[PDB]
């Protein structure tokens, strides 16, 4: 299908369009996009294997899940290291039990999983290893919404008094129309892929460089779509509550709005017990356990030694020699702070993981002795709450509705600014029990505030059991931030350096930064197997890179093999010395 | 001058343009920015005073600037309180004291203080105050710079190894020419302001939507400019240490440019002792003693009571009543976690101050026992060296030059995504002494090799005192950031809200984010006196309006008063009700 299939086919021809430049400053020529040289090596694809030890860095869910991948495909006398800086293993699979009573918990990071194609490979995942999904309500019933102090009403014009009609400044045209000017200026361009790639990718190249907020202002690349004044796009980013996109490449944004189009109405699943279920039973599958409190501080390669296990890592001063390939899963500002010198990545390579900017988020979770936003608010199925208040959005846990009496709340999930905010007013030194603090004074009053339909604050706090907790990922310095969100040109110019080994093809750069999927678990599992996929192609282990292909090729696959492919030429690239 | 002007005459304009729109929206006209209604009360400009107390919220620069001019104006039966939530005095000027010896401090907030004619009314303040001031080295001798660990060279091309030619990324054109490059970028809007201010006004505001990065790719509101590809532009991004300048609108960029065009090689100062001395010296002059540990949580006004003193505020759950004004100083994430209600704020106004963005900023100072850079490398006069490196930029302080044993060394200064990657290793929870954590090995690694043309990474361990302090200001909750940085747009719409009085002319939004001069010390002082003056005419107290001209006019005012003023129009439609 051609709307399952835009993203993939959006990635693949980016890698084409650098190679083909790189391929030219090679020789430099009449390599095109469409016409790159073919795979010399496709004429071919116990212990005639010799033994080879492999390393890799970080044990989110992408370096467990080569493991795991590693694991069932047991190549004879291939072993690996996994290290991982944090005493805890899971990395951004993070869930926070306050006890160990059934639903007493809360997702710090990954929650939710929606059920759309490019997401086979999550499914999968979850299949292997057992976990127990339940539904998830993103939408759900009777949840406020409160802006400019006033509450949402259905069928009513401008209900927040915001317009130039009732003394505001967001334009009549706008101020209820939000979600549909939004599908429009993406949908201009999804007709135009839809008629041709070839020239629906031209024209969506003279927007790459542009963000959401430009595209909105200037109406297209080429200035054919209807054009926004600042306060109309400031109302439709205050209305975006959820990870940044108005500073977000165009190009991009529009390439996401394609995501939901089996209709954007796909169910969504969440695991029953917690996000870090998964990391558990993955974990508990290894062969060779994570090894928790081990920091790389800098990774090398010796190119004077001519044997396969030439790499090394240095943990708390100490070398740890003899890898054949270094598998790099950490967010990219983690990698940024090793010392890569003894890699030799060429310049660009090193500007992609300096620069890309990562977005923050914040979660606060707080436990009240009933549920009072399912008993005396309505609130009974899920969903979530908006505002702009500083809590920004309340999200209404989908695992215990059924549940009586104690119940934790998720209430504010924050992104950005509004993260980096409520984030100032996190510690992870909590306060002397049972102090009361600032952050937790602020979220009862907000949430008082958004509840007043049914709450007074004197009700809410009487429920508040005294036990809360909250976390910011910006401030945890084994990640530095939710996730990548790359800005105008990033993902045009950097992608493709990011797929690439290094090192002579023995260096990977992995997870989901790393990936056209990227912001979500399948972006880390695509970036993983296909970090496999190129280790097997540099030793030439074809027996076993057809068992990757017959065993782990889930979805589509973002790589492109084969005949036409590309895989071999950005793997000579990466293994080109200077 | 008009070099001078042009900041002071962009500012006035812009309130013009906004004033005309709204006035023609009370009406609705033949309102135009040049044409506006005269002041209907200069015609006119002890205790026939009656009793009036205000309320000053936030003891930064700008809360005690309000303080000193109130008690040097000695206005009968006026009285004040301020309020101040941290326990220390000062905001983000904030000198941090290792023991106190000499020159045993770093300045964790504000520090250099450029000699050019809008900072008059900074040095002023110093004067009153009589702050020892010392030379501030900029530019320092033999300051080193390391770019894709690269040293930079005189004279040679390309010395870091970036350029197409050498097989980079970076054009050729520009990697040796990124301050020439940027220079001409903004010079062309430098012209058409200095032909006519009124063409080149309207030619800078087809821009005044752009970032930096949009301007340089597209070359010019009108495209007339040079145009830029993305490695270039990361490049003259790479190579801009200090706040963020890509992302700011590209007409402010313009008038920035203008600064230092006596031209730019002023002097710079720094106080000797600390900045905080000039807290110090402020705060020990008020006739009302700062109140710390007093958080502000709401801010009220009750338009049922006729009388002047009809305000209040609230702290730790108390109500603080009487206020005939309220001057709130704070950062504007503070502000807008306050309960606000019942100021009855305009949609508009309760925007800006919740949609501005702040710029992050972190510093890392650490002790050694002999200032090995003055010693061994040679770097005598200050300066600060500058790399890709994640410390980022190694500030070589100016008042310890002839120190011989112990000395402090600023040896990182982030800004923006670095500062928030550095930030994520700093704890307010110090390690237990004298364990060394990740940040200091990290700065250790980074200074070594950003000083390897004269140091071993062995000399500059041995060094090192076990002492160090670091400082992220978005992870402190009573700031949350260093400074305003405001986006495309923001300034044009937003600056005549935040300057705007509100609560009927009562209610002040104060602090360097309020001006045009933001970002600096000059800018908290401005608004403070601006918001002053809009008090002093609010009611009526026109001898004393007098005397804040003739005692407290330094520079060029910002606010345009007098007969074809606008002050009078901001206070009426602030002053608004609905
Ligand atoms: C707030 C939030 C909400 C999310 N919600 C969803 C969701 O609902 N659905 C979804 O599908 N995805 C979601 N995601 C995305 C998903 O969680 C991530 O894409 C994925 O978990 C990232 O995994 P990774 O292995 O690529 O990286 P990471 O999880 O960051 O793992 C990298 C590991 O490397 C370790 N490390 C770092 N430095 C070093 C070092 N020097 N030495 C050794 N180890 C090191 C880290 O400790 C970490 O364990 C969310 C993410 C966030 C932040
Ligand atoms: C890293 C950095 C470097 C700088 N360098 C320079 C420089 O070299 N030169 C220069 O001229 N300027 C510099 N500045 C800018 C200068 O420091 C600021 O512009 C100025 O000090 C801001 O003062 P203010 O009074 O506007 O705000 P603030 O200093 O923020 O003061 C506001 C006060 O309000 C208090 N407060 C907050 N919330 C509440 C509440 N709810 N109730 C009561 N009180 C509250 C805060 O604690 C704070 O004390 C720098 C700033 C930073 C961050
Ligand atoms: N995947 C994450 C983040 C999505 C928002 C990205 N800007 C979630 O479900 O919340
Ligand atoms: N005024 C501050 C910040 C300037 C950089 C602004 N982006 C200083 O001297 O460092």
Same mark, same amino acid.
């Given at each position: 299908? /051609?709307?399952?299939?835009?993203? =993939?086919?959006?990635?693949?021809? #980016?890698?084409?369009?650098?190679?083909?430049?790189?391929?030219?400053?090679?020789?430099?020529?009449?390599?095109?996009?469409?016409?790159?040289?073919?795979?010399?090596?496709?004429?071919?694809?116990?212990?005639? #294997?010799?033994? $080879?030890?492999?390393?890799?860095?970080?044990?989110?869910?992408?370096?467990?899940?080569?493991?795991?991948?590693?694991?069932?495909? +047991?190549?004879?006398?291939?072993?690996?290291?996994?290290?991982?800086?944090?005493?805890?293993?899971?990395?951004?699979?993070?869930?926070?039990?306050?006890?160990?009573?059934?639903?007493?918990?809360?997702?710090?990071?990954?929650? $939710?999983?929606?059920?759309?194609?490019?997401? +086979? $490979?999550?499914?999968?995942?979850?299949?292997? *290893?057992?976990?127990?999904?339940?539904?998830?309500?993103?939408?759900?019933?009777?949840?406020?919404?409160?802006?400019?102090?006033? /509450?949402?009403?259905?069928?009513?014009?401008?209900?927040?008094?915001?317009?130039?009609?009732?003394?505001?400044?967001?334009?009549?045209?706008?101020?209820?129309?939000?979600?549909?000017?939004?599908?429009?200026? /993406?949908?201009?361009?999804?007709?135009?892929?839809?008629?041709?790639?070839?020239?629906?990718?031209?024209?969506?190249?003279?927007?790459?460089?542009? =963000?959401?907020?430009?595209?909105?202002?200037?109406?297209?690349?080429?200035?054919?779509?209807?054009?926004?004044?600042?306060?109309?796009?400031?109302?439709?980013?205050? %209305?975006?509550?959820? *990870?940044?996109?108005?500073?977000?490449?165009?190009?991009?944004?529009?390439?996401?709005?394609?995501?939901?189009?089996?209709?954007?109405?796909?169910?969504?699943?969440?695991?029953?017990?917690?996000?870090?279920? #998964?990391?558990?039973?993955? +974990?508990?599958?290894?062969?060779?356990?994570?090894?928790?409190?081990?920091?790389?501080?800098?990774?090398?390669?010796? !190119?004077?030694?001519?044997?396969?296990?030439?790499?090394?890592?240095?943990?708390?001063?100490?070398?740890?020699?003899?890898?054949?390939?270094?598998?790099?899963? =950490?967010?990219?500002?983690?990698?940024? $702070?090793?010392? #890569?010198?003894?890699?030799?990545?060429?310049? *660009?390579?090193?500007?992609?993981?300096?620069?890309?900017?990562?977005?923050?988020?914040?979660?606060?979770?707080?436990? /009240?002795?009933?549920?009072?936003?399912?008993?005396?608010?309505?609130?009974?199925?899920?969903?979530?709450?908006?505002?702009?208040?500083?809590?920004?959005?309340?999200?209404?846990?989908?695992?215990?509705?059924?549940?009586?009496?104690?119940?934790? !709340?998720?209430?504010?999930?924050?992104?950005?600014?509004?993260? =980096?905010?409520?984030?100032? !007013?996190?510690?992870?030194?909590?306060? %002397?029990?049972?102090?009361?603090?600032?952050?937790?004074?602020?979220?009862?009053?907000?949430?008082?505030? !958004?509840?007043?339909?049914?709450?007074?604050?004197?009700?809410?706090?009487?429920?508040?059991?005294?036990?809360?907790?909250?976390?910011?990922?910006?401030?945890?310095?084994?990640?530095?931030?939710?996730?990548?969100?790359?800005?105008?040109?990033?993902?045009?110019?950097?992608?493709?350096?990011?797929?690439?080994?290094?090192?002579?093809?023995?260096?990977?750069?992995?997870?989901?930064?790393?990936?056209?999927?990227?912001?979500?678990?399948?972006?880390?599992?695509?970036?993983?197997?296909?970090?496999?996929? %190129?280790?097997?192609?540099?030793?030439?282990?074809?027996?076993?890179?057809?068992?990757?292909?017959?065993?782990?090729?889930?979805?589509?696959?973002?790589?492109?093999?084969?005949?036409?492919?590309?895989?071999?030429?950005?793997?000579?690239?990466?293994?080109?010395?200077?």
């Amino acid at each position: 299908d /051609f709307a399952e299939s835009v993203r =993939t086919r959006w990635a693949r021809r #980016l890698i084409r369009e650098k190679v083909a430049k790189e391929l030219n400053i090679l020789t430099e020529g009449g390599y095109s996009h469409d016409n790159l040289p073919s795979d010399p090596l496709y004429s071919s694809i116990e212990e005639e #294997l010799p033994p $080879r030890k492999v390393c890799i860095v970080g044990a989110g869910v992408s370096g467990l899940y080569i493991a795991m991948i590693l694991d069932d495909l +047991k190549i004879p006398n291939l072993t690996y290291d996994i290290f991982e800086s944090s005493s805890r293993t899971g990395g951004r699979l993070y869930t926070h039990h306050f006890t160990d009573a059934k639903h007493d918990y809360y997702d710090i990071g990954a929650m $939710r999983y929606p059920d759309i194609p490019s997401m +086979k $490979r999550t499914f999968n995942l979850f299949k292997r *290893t057992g976990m127990p999904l339940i539904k998830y309500y993103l939408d759900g019933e009777n949840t406020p919404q409160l802006y400019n102090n006033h /509450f949402f009403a259905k069928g009513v014009v401008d209900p927040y008094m915001v317009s130039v009609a009732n003394g505001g400044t967001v334009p009549d045209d706008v101020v209820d129309s939000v979600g549909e000017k939004l599908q429009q200026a /993406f949908g201009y361009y999804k007709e135009k892929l839809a008629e041709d790639f070839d020239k629906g990718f031209d024209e969506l190249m003279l927007v790459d460089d542009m =963000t959401t907020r430009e595209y909105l202002k200037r109406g297209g690349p080429k200035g054919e779509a209807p054009k926004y004044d600042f306060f109309a796009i400031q109302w439709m980013e205050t %209305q975006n509550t959820g *990870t940044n996109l108005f500073d977000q490449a165009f190009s991009e944004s529009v390439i996401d709005s394609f995501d939901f189009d089996n209709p954007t109405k796909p169910e969504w699943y969440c695991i029953e017990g917690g996000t870090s279920l #998964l990391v558990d039973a993955m +974990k508990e599958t290894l062969v060779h356990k994570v090894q928790n409190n081990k920091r790389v501080e800098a990774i090398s390669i010796d !190119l004077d030694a001519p044997d396969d296990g030439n790499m090394s890592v240095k943990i708390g001063g100490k070398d740890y020699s003899g890898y054949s390939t270094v598998f790099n899963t =950490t967010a990219l500002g983690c990698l940024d $702070r090793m010392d #890569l010198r003894g890699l030799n990545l060429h310049p *660009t390579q090193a500007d992609a993981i300096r620069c890309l900017h990562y977005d923050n988020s914040t979660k606060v979770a707080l436990k /009240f002795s009933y549920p009072w936003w399912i008993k005396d608010c309505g609130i009974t199925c899920g969903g979530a709450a908006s505002t702009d208040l500083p809590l920004r959005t309340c999200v209404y846990p989908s695992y215990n509705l059924g549940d009586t009496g104690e119940a934790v !709340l998720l209430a504010s999930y924050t992104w950005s600014q509004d993260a =980096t905010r409520i984030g100032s !007013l996190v510690k992870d030194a909590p306060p %002397q029990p049972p102090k009361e603090d600032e952050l937790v004074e602020l979220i009862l009053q907000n949430l008082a505030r !958004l509840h007043a339909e049914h709450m007074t604050y004197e009700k809410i706090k009487e429920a508040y059991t005294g036990v809360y907790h909250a976390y910011c990922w910006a401030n945890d310095p084994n990640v530095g931030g939710a996730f990548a969100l790359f800005g105008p040109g990033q993902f045009s110019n950097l992608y493709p350096y990011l797929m690439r080994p290094a090192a002579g093809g023995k260096f990977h750069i992995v997870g989901e930064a790393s990936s056209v999927h990227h912001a979500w678990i399948i972006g880390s599992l695509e970036s993983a197997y296909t970090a496999v996929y %190129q280790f097997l192609y540099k030793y030439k282990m074809w027996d076993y890179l057809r068992l990757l292909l017959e065993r782990w090729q889930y979805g589509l696959q973002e790589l492109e093999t084969g005949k036409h492919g590309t895989a071999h030429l950005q793997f000579i690239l990466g293994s080109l010395p200077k």
